[PDB]
Design an enzyme around this catalytic site. Structure first.
Site, mmCIF file in Angstrom:
data_model
loop_
_atom_site.group_PDB
_atom_site.id
_atom_site.type_symbol
_atom_site.label_atom_id
_atom_site.label_comp_id
_atom_site.label_asym_id
_atom_site.label_seq_id
_atom_site.Cartn_x
_atom_site.Cartn_y
_atom_site.Cartn_z
ATOM 1 N N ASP B 36 150.257 20.806 4.778
ATOM 2 C CA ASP B 36 151.035 19.643 4.429
ATOM 3 C C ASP B 36 151.963 19.783 5.646
ATOM 4 O O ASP B 36 153.065 20.523 5.549
ATOM 5 C CB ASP B 36 151.781 19.926 3.019
ATOM 6 C CG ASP B 36 152.371 18.514 2.798
ATOM 7 O OD1 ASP B 36 153.410 18.608 1.912
ATOM 8 O OD2 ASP B 36 152.449 17.514 3.562
ATOM 9 N N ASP B 220 151.420 13.046 8.867
ATOM 10 C CA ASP B 220 151.389 13.756 7.411
ATOM 11 C C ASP B 220 150.111 14.301 7.116
ATOM 12 O O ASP B 220 149.313 13.386 6.366
ATOM 13 C CB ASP B 220 152.296 13.160 6.633
ATOM 14 C CG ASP B 220 152.596 13.857 4.977
ATOM 15 O OD1 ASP B 220 151.934 14.965 5.092
ATOM 16 O OD2 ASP B 220 153.158 13.293 4.279
#
Ligand SMILES: CC(=O)Nc1ccc(CN2CCC3(CC2)C(NC2CCCCC2)=NC(=O)N3c2cccc(F)c2)cc1
Ligand SMILES: CC(=O)Nc1ccc(CN2CCC3(CC2)C(NC2CCCCC2)=NC(=O)N3c2cccc(F)c2)cc1
Lengths: 368, 368
Positions: B36, B220
């Site tokens: 992440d 992201d």
């Protein structure tokens, strides 16, 4: 079950040795490494060789440091030469640590690598006293214990026909049944122990116990056979022959020069005796015994099952090799200078390998 | 090919995120961890949960140190609470190192874990500025770089429908074709970048470039969609609708409220436009563009192939999520404060994802 991720981290081909994955250098280079409690150098194939599927490429490792000194390790049967350096080392299916270790990059060898073994190096787990070039070259396990909080102990479950487990830093209770019995490590060089009595089918060989440990007795995961000093070998063979007389075998069979084969599933294990080695215990005058089955000392070599007698002679002391270890969960408790044996969670329907005690044995100190 | 052992170290289910194995504590506890780049905490499930196949058991780890402080991490869509500590951490299919890292043990959560995802924690790869409870909790990658010689760089190859590679400490040239084009990291908190122009089938959206980065634009890996600020979303949908007018779709499709399905193998990719995002380059007035295909922005959700439009609206800036990353090998060059894009070694027979430049774009500084 806290050591679960180390279970079954060993592989091998029958009679060709047990190996563990080790990851060396940066970026990672993973190789298959022979687990060898009978030597003390960490060394890897580092150049092409007919028998190697891969090798260590020092030039590709940014963290490799050339010690700019050579190293040579000779045995009766084989030898290798290489260059000393250090590099980062982990064991992906061992302890969660990374250490900087001495590594010998093997550039030349004679009769060292085994065609088809799948291993490309050796992890010498014995002590610095027997390291080459000398005892100032810290062995891998010494580095591991000095650099990390990993407890100074490992244990081996060698499963015969291969697979097994090397538990580093502890004992996994799922790998054995019954109790662990400990014998002292007499001296920290090889894993040296003291055999105080030998029986063939419960019958005492009746040799002076000094002969059993004549010149030393060692525990060696890198040696296939049970090796016995000549005088002991001869007496043991005479006794095994007598106990297995319901069938006759050529003399060369007992000498490993001839094989005998049986049609699949018909090997008369029942006709062969069990062998007991009594080991010095941890209390005055107390011993225990480990008992092995023919399934251990007769090793398989496709309609026929061929076997080699895997007890052989030695001029350099007794070697308790894989034929002994395969029956057992073996604990190399370096922290308490002792080796433990328990019945392995890895026999037939009539007989089982055993670890039994305590027995009373007097003057065991005289046996060394 | 020196980074070969890190290739294909990522797995996932489509739309549910890419994860890597990480090994925590002593003895080893290996878990699947969401990669992440949009958060900065390393956190793992640490108590039973309906959606978890396993979890971290701190009591079984001898090297675990309780920081005796709690931590709470909230988002719009979900949140978790847990306890802070530190423990030894490695990545078995990543760099050959072991570090002591901050780890949040997740004891409670709301809408955080995904049923069937196969991951049990998250690896927040963004910077300390956005760590919880605050920026004094060193993120994992910061610890890695501080404790080891691993270069301050990682790269991600996310392969859509899943698998992929996270190369830590370097760039693997087999993972991409053509050149790498770099955009500056504007600020070290999220991986913040500057979009200077948007085209739908080569047609400029013609919005003031400030709107594209209104409030920020981030890269992201933990967000599935391309998320766009409302005003930009609306203009982009109007343009995509117009370019794909050879078929009509319900309004709700463009809003992600409705799916459309096609019989296996008949999805008319050809009718949908390519989308280009121009990014600020490394030289004055120079930009480059990344171009994505409908195969990226229409995500599969057994005789029919169902798709969801994976461009959605945001009130917290642009998020270049996995729909953008999947077309590309993406280099998070933290050492040089820049992000690189190249065509991924992981399109159809008429069109391909592309990274192209250089273009001349004036006043790009005005876009932030
Ligand atoms: C081709 C092959 O089979 N490769 C192999 C097998 C296994 C191994 C581990 N070890 C190394 C050393 C070994 C026993 C096994 C040794 N042991 C000891 C000396 C001191 C006293 C008590 C035995 N004598 C020897 O001649 N060895 C020996 C045996 C065979 C080959 C070899 F190159 C050395 C290495 C290499
Ligand atoms: C059930 C599930 O799907 N589990 C999941 C999926 C994915 C993930 C990684 N991330 C975490 C954070 C995420 C984006 C994805 C976020 N991102 C940013 C805020 C600042 C500005 C720009 C976006 N907003 C959110 O609401 N998120 C978010 C999204 C879904 C669930 C969730 F709990 C938080 C975690 C958990």
């Amino acid at each position: 079950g806290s050591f679960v991720e180390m279970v079954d981290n060993l592989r091998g081909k029958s009679g060709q040795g047990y190996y563990v994955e080790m990851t060396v250098g940066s970026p990672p280079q993973t190789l298959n490494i022979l687990v060898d409690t009978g030597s003390s150098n960490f060394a890897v194939g580092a150049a092409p060789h007919p028998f190697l599927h891969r090798y260590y490429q020092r030039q590709l490792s940014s963290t490799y440091r050339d010690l700019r000194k050579g190293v040579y390790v000779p045995y009766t049967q084989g030898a290798w030469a290489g260059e000393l350096g250090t590099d980062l080392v982990s064991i992906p299916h061992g302890p969660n640590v990374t250490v900087r270790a001495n590594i010998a990059a093997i550039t030349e060898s004679d009769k060292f690598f085994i065609n088809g073994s799948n291993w490309e190096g050796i992890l010498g787990l014995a002590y610095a006293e027997i390291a080459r070039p000398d005892d100032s070259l810290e062995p891998f396990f010494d580095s591991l214990v000095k650099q990390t909080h990993v407890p100074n102990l490992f244990s081996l479950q060698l499963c015969g026909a291969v697979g097994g487990s090397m538990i580093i830093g502890g004992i996994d209770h799922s790998l054995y049944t019954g109790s662990l019995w400990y014998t002292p490590i007499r001296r920290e060089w090889y894993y040296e122990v003291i055999i105080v009595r030998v029986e063939i089918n419960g019958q005492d060989l009746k040799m002076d116990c000094k002969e059993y440990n004549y010149d030393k007795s060692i525990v060696d995961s890198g040696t296939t056979n049970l090796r016995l000093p000549k005088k002991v070998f001869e007496a043991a063979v005479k006794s095994i022959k007598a106990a297995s007389s319901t069938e006759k075998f050529p003399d060369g069979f007992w000498l490993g020069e001839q094989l005998v084969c049986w049609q699949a599933g018909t090997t008369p294990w029942n006709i062969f005796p069990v062998i007991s080695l009594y080991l010095m215990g941890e209390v005055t005058n107390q011993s225990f015994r480990i008992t092995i089955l023919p399934q251990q000392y007769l090793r398989p070599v496709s309609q026929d099952d061929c076997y080699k007698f895997a007890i052989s002679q030695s001029s350099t002391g007794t070697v308790m090799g894989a034929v002994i270890m395969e029956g057992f969960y073996v604990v190399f408790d370096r922290a308490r200078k002792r080796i433990g044996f328990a019945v392995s969670a890895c026999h037939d329907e009539f007989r089982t390998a055993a670890v039994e005690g305590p027995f009373v044995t007097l003057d065991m100190e005289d046996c060394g």
